[PDB]
Write a protein that binds this ligand. Structure first.
Ligand code: 95R
Length: 154
């Protein structure tokens, strides 16, 4: 039993856009933009909607780069996250109620203030390799189990 999520990383030659989560689950961490997929929208629709709602940006093209399943101890639903990549954006990123966006040089990604799983799978994203991941959390800090592989088809 899974629930669909989207995660969008704006990745330009020298820099990546991240958003500081301001409230709710995972507040205080930087992450890509995304969230729950709603009924009546494609997964990629959901990804553009979340990217716009949280950063003001729209995009010409989103590219599927990964899928990650998250389990949390004691939580019935799993997160089935579809990860997207884009370089060309439309607009300038602005703060939302949810997310404060900031650019980061690729050698200054704030991994210690990001979700732990990102340290595992961000490198594959940075190499523009497609991947499948699984991460079992206990709470929001401890990864009990994980798998990670490159794929031909996300
Ligand atoms: C906006 O942040 C996310 C959107 C969709 C899925 C996951 C996320 C954020 C917040 C969240 O719930 N989980 C963590 C995030 C990651 O960067 C990868 C998994 C850990």
């Amino acid at each position: 039993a899974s629930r669909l999520y989207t995660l969008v990383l704006v990745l330009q030659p020298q820099r990546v856009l991240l958003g500081m989560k301001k409230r709710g689950f995972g507040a205080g961490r930087w992450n890509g933009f995304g969230g729950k997929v709603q009924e009546g929208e494609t997964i990629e629709d959901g990804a553009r909607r979340e990217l716009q709602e949280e950063s003001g940006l729209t995009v010409d093209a989103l590219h599927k780069v990964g899928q990650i399943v998250f389990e949390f101890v004691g939580e019935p639903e799993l997160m089935d996250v579809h990860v997207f990549c884009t370089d060309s954006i439309q607009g300038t990123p602005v703060e939302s109620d949810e997310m404060r966006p900031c650019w980061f040089q690729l050698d200054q990604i704030p991994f210690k203030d990001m979700w732990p799983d990102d340290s595992y799978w961000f490198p594959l994203l940075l190499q523009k390799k497609k991947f499948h991941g699984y991460f079992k959390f206990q709470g929001q800090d401890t990864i009990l189990d994980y798998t990670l592989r490159e794929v031909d088809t996300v």
